[PDB]
Structure 1
Amino acid sequence: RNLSALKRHRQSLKRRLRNKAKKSAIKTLSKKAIQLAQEGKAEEALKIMRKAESLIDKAAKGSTLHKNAAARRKSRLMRKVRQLLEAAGAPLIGGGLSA
């Protein structure tokens, strides 16, 4: 009548539910960063972005993200942020963005 493969569904649900979160985590955070960066908060933006970054490659370990999933995100994050901090700010603190 039935098959124990829903075991797979039960999981299907867990995992989704997991990464669902670190997913939306980095999301919001990704934003809080670039927000500042643009707003002018030179270093305190760099800060957050330094964090976001981690949380990303961090997520990339598992199955949430992967391949360039992360690296793409980054090449945009610490792309635009430096592309908003040039709105007259001079990269303050030694956040991720390299000299």
Structure 2
Amino acid sequence: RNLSALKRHRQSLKRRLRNKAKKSAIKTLSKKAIQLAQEGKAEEALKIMRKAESLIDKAAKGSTLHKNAAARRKSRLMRKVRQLLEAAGAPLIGGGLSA
């Protein structure tokens, strides 16, 4: 019994926790953005979306989402937001949208 690979496990635990923090928060932010989009608040909503995007990017940069997954997520969010905005709003801050 007993090997110095418990260290790795410990490391992973910490990393897992950090990952969870990154990811859950991101998810929450996304949800909030979606909610904002729902009625047509636009500017604040846009800001929130931007923040979420930033968070996602940060996660990608670190050892969380990584790669193109983050990008995909962003696309999903942004497109959804745009769709929601079609029900009243139009880009008020400029923000995440390409206008």
> TM-score, normalised to structure 1's length?
0.95
Measured on the aligned residues, the alpha-carbon RMSD in Å equals 0.9
Greater than 6 Å deviation, 4+ residue runs = none
Paired residue secondary structure (1:3): coil
Q: Distance in 1 between matches of 2:3 and 2:44?
A: 53
Cα deviation, 1:4-42, whole Å, max 9, x if unaligned, reads 100000011000011110110111001111111122111
Q: CA deviation at 1:87?
A: 0.5
Q: Which range moved further: 89-98 or 7-16?
A: 89-98
- 2:90 & 2:12 partners in 1: Cα distance? 46
Q: Which runs of 5+ in 1 are unaligned?
A: none
What are structure 2's unaligned runs of at least 5 residues? none
Q: Distance in 1 between matches of 2:95 and 2:22?
A: 22
CA-CA distance at 1:88 after TM superposition = 2.0
CA distance in 2, matches of 1:28, 1:12: 24
Distance 1:6 1:93 in 2: 50
Corresponding residue of 1:89: 89
Q: Deviations over 1:25-60 (max 9, x none)?
A: 111001111111122111110010010000001000
| Secondary structure in structure 1 of the residue aligned to 2:22 | helix
Aligned to 1:12: 12
Size of the alignment, in residue pairs? 99
